[PDB]
């Protein structure tokens, strides 16, 4: 029996799917043709992921900053997000993959709301891959959740003020229960961190590539782990 | 009349300056030599932000983990620090700049202690750009602060936990009255930001350069200055 133990101890990848717009307008197409295809590489990258050991995959598919952009783009990335849902959840399922949504679930329509919570339920049992799906996420959001949860024990007069310490917030962000961000891969070529994980990823490998998230192969996601082996 | 406009709007810089153990290791040497010639690059970074109307510069100089370093290591920086502080403070009250020291000074000796409230103090009024120096400063540590000063209004009945939101957060972490950090350099080669400024550089440009921090030269800042402007 062997199992498929990435390279020097990678445990919990990350990724800015990014670029995903300047694929579509750079073959004369409208942004929501370049999110469409940005799903296969999604399928992709979460099959190369649980085939080779990786304990947690976490992507960001959607902002706290990113209701400022065009009403239309945002309501076509919401009906793709349900279509994404129901072309996987059967095979994450079957993968032994935990689905989790992280971010705040409240703004989306009830369809997707009702999606989302029935595709955790489904697979919250697996103990393969965990992957996350970052949506309506910021990092300082997620800093923040946690800051009102401590706060409201305060009130209740069950913390003091100076009990507080890193280790009691980082009990409270998301994704506290999984290994640490071990590496950030930023595809589409800018070079920022645009309010992703702040917390969680104070001790991460950061890896940019200008690969468009349409076209990252398991080859790109291979090289960002190579990168992690000799980083 | 006519001042210095940093390229696109650059209006803080943030510094990690690695490699110096690495710079001394290379020519044999041990790593406090390494500390003391970055200390020159330091003054030459300094200059060059001044010199080029930055408005703010933030240099990482010692993290909040790093008290695992050996203890003579330790020991040798604190030292460095006062020299250094010594040989630039009235240099810097005489540029016009700004001094604070960001970070949990209250583990440092009576005599560093005293020389940062005093350089503080000197240069308090002046009003050109302003120097922030991270030293035992960790980004968790610094929301952490803010947290705990929320949480101490929230006991005293003066805040209600639902009341806590970003922009109220935002205006109790470190250098809350500067412009947000632009751009993050890291020279050394390594691609992390070790936890620098999480909540600060949620939206900055990040520029990793395998130059060592003793190296770092106005040359190698008009680069990355550049990078920004074109990124
Ligand atoms: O984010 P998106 O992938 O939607 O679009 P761009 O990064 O290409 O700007
Ligand atoms: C790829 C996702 C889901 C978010 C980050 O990209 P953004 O375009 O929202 O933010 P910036 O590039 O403006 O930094
Ligand atoms: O941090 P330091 O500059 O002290 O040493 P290295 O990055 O070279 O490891
Ligand atoms: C250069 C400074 C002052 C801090 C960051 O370097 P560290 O060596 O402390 O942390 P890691 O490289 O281990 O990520
Ligand atoms: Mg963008
Ligand atoms: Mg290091």
Tied chains: 1, 2.
């Excluded at 009906?79 to 989306?108: M, P, Q, Y």
């Excluded at 949506?135 to 100076?162: C, F, H, M, S, T």
């Amino acid at each position: 029996l062997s199992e498929k133990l990435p390279a020097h101890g990678c445990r919990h990848v990350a990724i800015i799917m990014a670029g995903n717009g300047r694929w579509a307008k750079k073959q004369g197409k409208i942004r929501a043709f370049g999110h469409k295809a940005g799903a296969k590489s999604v399928r992709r990258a979460v099959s190369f992921a649980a085939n080779n050991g990786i304990e947690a995959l976490t992507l960001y598919a959607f902002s706290s900053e990113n209701w400022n952009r065009p009403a239309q783009e945002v309501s076509a990335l919401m009906e793709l997000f349900v279509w994404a849902l129901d072309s996987e959840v059967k095979s994450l399922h079957r993968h032994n993959v935990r689905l989790r949504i992280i971010g705040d679930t409240s703004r989306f329509n009830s369809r997707l709301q009702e999606r989302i919570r029935k595709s955790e339920a489904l697979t919250a049992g697996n103990t393969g891959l965990t992957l996350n799906i970052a949506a309506n996420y910021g990092g300082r959001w997620d800093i923040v959740q946690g800051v009102r949860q401590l706060a409201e024990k305060v009130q209740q007069g069950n913390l003091q003020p100076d009990q507080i310490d890193e280790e009691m917030l980082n009990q409270h962000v998301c994704m506290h229960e999984l290994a640490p961000v071990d590496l950030v891969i930023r595809t589409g070529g800018e070079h920022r961190i645009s309010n992703f994980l702040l917390w969680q990823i104070a001790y991460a490998e950061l890896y940019f590539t200008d690969v468009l998230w349409p076209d990252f192969d398991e080859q790109d996601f291979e090289g960002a782990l190579n990168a992690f082996a000799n980083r």
